[PDB]
Amino acid sequence: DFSAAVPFLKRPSNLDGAYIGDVGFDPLGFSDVFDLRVLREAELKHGRFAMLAVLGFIVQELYTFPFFPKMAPVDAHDYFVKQGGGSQIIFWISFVELFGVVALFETLQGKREPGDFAFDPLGLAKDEATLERYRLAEVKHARLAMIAIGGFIHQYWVTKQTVLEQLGNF
């Protein structure tokens, strides 16, 4: 059959709706070679980091903590490389990513969904149907935010104005 997204491209054949958010889009054929659990692991991880980054880029413009000096987020990266806070964040992410390595091994061995860490403290996933719609929304937001974060950082480079101030000006 044909891909739902691209009508004239054939369906990849490793993508038969097994993973939510599948629209049959995979022209370069990475699912014909590589494991889709690993690729969905990577898609959801990149997407969650990007979603947090876009929220951070905007909120950091709106507010910053009193103990830290006020500055733009790219300058924040460089300041906290030299200050020590960046190493703390890198270390704690690396610490969590150790048990993430264990989690990815559990996914490869079949006993875990690729983005599932059982992280539902506030019980928002009331029912299975609600979870399916929520994870479709998570996939769509994750992809959209990857595009968005690239835009903010690259535009900041080209025009040295922050995202809220760039919308505010021009």
Partner 1 sequence: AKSKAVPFLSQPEALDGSMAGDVGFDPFGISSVIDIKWLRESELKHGRICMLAATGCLVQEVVHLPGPAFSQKMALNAWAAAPRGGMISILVAIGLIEMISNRFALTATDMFANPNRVPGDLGFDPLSLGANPANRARFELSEVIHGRAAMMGFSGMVHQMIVSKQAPIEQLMHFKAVDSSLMKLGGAAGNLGY
Partner 2 sequence: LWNEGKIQGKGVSVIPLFPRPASLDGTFPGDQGFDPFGFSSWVNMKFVAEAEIKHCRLAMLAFAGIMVESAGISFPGATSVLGSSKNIFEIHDKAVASGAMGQILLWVSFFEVVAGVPAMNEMLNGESSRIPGYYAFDPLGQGKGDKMGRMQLSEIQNGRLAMLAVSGIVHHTLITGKGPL
Partner 3 sequence: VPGDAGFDPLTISAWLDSRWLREAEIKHCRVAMLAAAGCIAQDIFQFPGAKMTALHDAAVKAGSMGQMLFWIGFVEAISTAATIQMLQGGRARMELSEIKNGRLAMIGFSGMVHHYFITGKGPIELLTS
Ligand X SMILES: CCCCCCCCCCCCCCCC(=O)OC[C@H](COP(=O)(O)OC[C@@H](O)CO)OC(=O)CCCCCCCCCCCCCCC
Ligand Y SMILES: CC1=C(C#C/C(C)=C/C=C/C(C)=C/C=C/C=C(C)/C=C/C=C(\C)C#CC2=C(C)C[C@@H](O)CC2(C)C)C(C)(C)C[C@H](O)C1
Residues that bind ligand X (CB under 6 A): 87, 91
8 is in the binding site of which of partner 1, partner 3, ligand IHT, none (Cβ under 5 to 8 A by kind)?
A: partner 3
Least Å distance, CB 134 to ligand Y, is 9
- Contact partner at residue 88 from ligand Y, partner 2, ligand CLA, none, CB < 5 to 8 Å by partner kind: ligand CLA
Round the CA-based radius of gyration of the chain to a whole number and report it: 19
Candidate ranges 82-90, 103-111, 114-122, 134-142; the one touching ligand CLA (CB under 6 A): 82-90
168 binds, among ligand CLA, partner 3, partner 2, none (CB under 5 to 8 A by kind): none
Across the strands, what pairs with 2?
Answer: 10
Q: Whole-number minimum distance, CB 105 to ligand Y, in Å?
A: 22
Torsion over CA of 92, 94, 97 and 98, rounded to 10 degrees?
A: -110
Residue 12 neighbours by CB distance under 10 Å: 19
Residue 102 binds which entry of partner 3, partner 1, ligand Y, none, with Cβ cut-offs from 5 to 8 Å by kind?
partner 1
CA atoms within a 13 Å half-sphere pointing along the CA-CB vector of 154 = 6
3-state secondary structure of 10: strand
**130-139 long-range Cβ contacts below 8 angstroms, 24+ apart:** 132/20, 135/20, 135/21, 136/20, 136/21, 138/44, 138/47, 139/20, 139/21, 139/43, 139/44, 139/47
- Contacting residue, 147, 160, 164, 165, with ligand IHT by CB under 6 A: 147
Could you count the other beta carbons within 10 Å of the beta carbon of residue 44?
21
Binding stretches for partner 3 (CB under 8 A): 6, 8-10, 27-28
Q: For residue 40, count other CB atoms closer than 10 A to its CB.
A: 21
As measured in angstroms, the least distance from the Cβ of 145 to ligand Y is 4
List residues binding ligand Y (CB under 6 A). 51, 54-55, 119-122, 124, 141, 144-145, 148, 151-152, 155, 163, 166
Residues that bind ligand IHT (CB under 6 A): 74, 77-78, 146-147, 149-150, 153
